[PDB]
Ligand binder design. Structure first.
Ligand SMILES: Nc1ncnc2c1ncn2[C@@H]1O[C@H](COP(=O)(O)OP(=O)(O)NP(=O)(O)O)[C@@H](O)[C@H]1O
Ligand SMILES: Nc1ncnc2c1ncn2[C@@H]1O[C@H](COP(=O)(O)OP(=O)(O)NP(=O)(O)O)[C@@H](O)[C@H]1O
Ligand SMILES: [Mg+2]
Ligand SMILES: [Mg+2]
Lengths: 365, 471
């Protein structure tokens, strides 16, 4: 009772016609606006990252040109009263051509475009896809942008758009070199006019940006990205704990893949995990799965620039390198513990044995 | 000190230049290829899904012309020797114009155009985003397509491309109405020229496709979508085999609930509780698999339940591998939480002993459910499932909190319990004999994850839960 209808029944007649793939751009834009990210909030994340890059770029050229570095800041003002968000940066900024192209062309990344020339600033430039800015439209009735290029005879420009097929660009002056982005919020999104809300978002995704950051005049950071160089406040921060670390491991490596990671073991038991970053932007607040589940008591921070990220940037690409990275971490963690039950008496077992149950939890598997 | 650089300094001099958004089509195709899906295998799913659409559309228009229908099938052929995987449908197929537009334009969906022109057959069309076909480029050096429209004076065409910004279209003779897609696998992807591998993929995602599917000659979709049938036209042998499929188990369900609602959104679902003692329901949309693990659509305390939940309108992520949450998955999951809680309380009300060992085998999850829940009405909801033992009824028997709210009244004011590892310690306790001869009644809990549960519940049915080993 076999049944197939697949047979070699075709014959191509008359020479082909050659064509070029094209795009339903408005539908692409809204696909990003309502079918790409899990939470609306990440739009902030995206914008911040843009700013970072803008700044990074600037200083790169500046550094490579023996010129002093102006104050390089990122500002977030929340206007509750007028229903808006604004993010502004002292970065390199756009010209009109750069406007039209980088903002108006979908999937264009003048950042990765910048990258394909450089390798220091290559390690901190964050964007790669060319779709992130459009996250604004998740929450925006309308987007207002003013920008001006660091380069000499630059005019200011007003690039604005409603989020649908057409953007428009007028010449605007009185724009500070860099870029300001005013977002006028949708009704169901006025919650981002809240300083407290925006604060929580930034603390969530961009708590560790390489440039000073001022929400409504208050500075944010001053929390150093320790996993790349008082593990105490860092443990009790990332693990969220009024507790302090029994055990600590700072683990950098570039054999296997580039990994910059720190692991804590906390002082209470659980009764009843980690967190993954890339280029100082949060990928998953609770990071699953890049740590064997018997090791769920451990937590802290794993970073790797060389993780392929999903288009959403909230996901690892389970291109199998990732849970083989998992395996690498299991290896160095084991070696960590056996070594630290030979550097002290303590040890591997009755020491922290609210966790011995995690290791024949361990050979459950 | 407060520092802000942001102030309204700008002023617009001119008048605007108008522009249209454009796109980098090649980088986009590549974004679909290397950065969208969690695993490559899903290209099969997509093809099949989009293939499915072709048939449905054809059906819809043949029926709307009063035509009889052709044989409406889906065929997959793996050729290991030429390293290709092929999918052919006998659906509507494409004209030349339809080839250029529907394959050549990114995010173009002739399927949802077809839908935005359409009632009845609208529940079935899978596609909406218009990027799915391109998933083939995850695994293809090159893609051969032949298609001929079911339109009357149709010609046949060969649309072919390597996934790099350019495709070509030729006229072709000998094309059967519908579409053949021959995928020429890449070197590290001839993995998908295996009959076993592909069979696995097909059963994983596309096991309930509403058209007969033949792989290398064999019929595949042989299992009926039981959650869309009327609850009486399914009874124990199909429920057993369906459970023993979705829950990968080799026992029987203790409990079976067939739940259908359009209160909020369309739910067509089955929930099973297994008969083994424990040592994630499956999510579908339009008969296509979304998550093996449907987390989150059920609260995590109901993770012990297995089975299937389907909904036509679950907002899908661009990947179709994830759920995009709107207001509606919160509400979906509170719908399912309460329908399940009610299920367990009333099926306790119809058979008390089977519920008794349901509690002795699964009470653990309800305890957890009560300690974790934020809203306390919810805590009380789960609390109606808790059965403890009591002093006033013989050793062994259990009782609900509500039965104790009924059995204590008049001038009695609170509920409470005593926790201890055995009954004889509970029944021989200083604290309870003190509770016994001013005697108001005291519950007995011997699974002291029960006193944690009771401490977090704190109050049930307009009353507090007070301790006796704390008076
Ligand atoms: N604030 C800004 N200042 C200067 N240039 C910017 C700014 N925001 C965006 N751009 C430019 O416009 C592009 C659009 O940004 P975006 O949509 O975020 O894509 P991307 O940052 O390049 N990569 P991704 O964010 O992952 O999609 C950037 O790549 C820059 O070239
Ligand atoms: N097997 C097929 N037979 C005929 N037409 C097809 C077939 N597959 C795709 N098409 C056409 O190509 C278009 C693009 O489909 P596709 O890129 O797979 O995404 P979509 O089906 O439109 N929606 P989605 O599944 O979410 O991506 C469809 O709308 C059809 O017009
Ligand atoms: Mg960006
Ligand atoms: Mg499709």
């Amino acid at each position: 009772p076999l049944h197939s209808i697949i047979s070699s029944t075709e014959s191509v007649q008359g020479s082909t016609s050659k064509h070029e793939f094209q795009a339903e751009t408005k539908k692409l834009l809204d696909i990003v606006a309502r079918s790409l990210y899990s939470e609306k909030e990440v739009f902030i994340r995206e914008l911040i990252s843009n700013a970072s890059d803008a700044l990074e770029k600037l200083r790169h050229k500046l550094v490579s040109d023996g010129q002093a570095l102006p104050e390089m800041e990122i500002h977030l003002q929340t206007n509750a009263e007028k229903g808006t968000i604004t993010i502004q940066d002292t970065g390199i900024g756009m010209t009109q051509e750069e406007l039209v192209s980088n903002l108006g062309t979908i999937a264009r990344s003048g950042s990765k475009a910048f990258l394909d020339a450089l390798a220091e600033a290559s390690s901190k430039i964050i964007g790669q896809f060319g779709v992130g800015f459009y996250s604004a439209f998740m929450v925006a009735d309308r987007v207002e942008v003013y920008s001006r290029s660091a380069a000499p005879g630059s005019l200011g420009y007003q690039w604005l758009s409603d989020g649908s097929g057409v953007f428009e660009i007028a010449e605007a002056s009185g724009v500070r070199t860099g870029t300001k982005i005013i977002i006028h919020l949708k009704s169901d999104c006025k919650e981002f006019s809240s300083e407290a809300r925006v604060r929580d978002v930034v603390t969530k995704y961009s708590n560790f940006v390489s440039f000073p950051l001022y929400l409504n005049g208050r500075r944010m950071n001053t929390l150093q990205a320790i996993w790349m160089m008082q593990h105490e406040e860092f443990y009790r921060y990332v693990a969220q704990a009024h507790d302090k670390p029994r055990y600590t491991l700072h683990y950098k490596t570039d054999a296997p893949l580039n990994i910059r990671s720190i692991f804590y073991v906390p002082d209470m038991k659980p009764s009843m995990s980690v967190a993954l970053y890339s280029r100082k932007v949060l990928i998953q607040t609770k990071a699953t799965d890049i740590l064997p589940k018997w090791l769920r008591f451990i937590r802290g921070v794993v970073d790797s620039e060389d993780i392929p990220l999903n288009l959403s940037r909230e996901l690892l690409q389970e291109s199998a390198l990732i849970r083989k990275l998992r395996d690498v971490l299991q290896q160095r963690l084991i070696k960590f513990f056996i070594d630290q039950s030979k550097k002290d008496a303590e040890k591997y077992a009755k020491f922290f044995e609210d966790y011995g149950l995690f290791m024949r939890e361990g050979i459950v598997t």
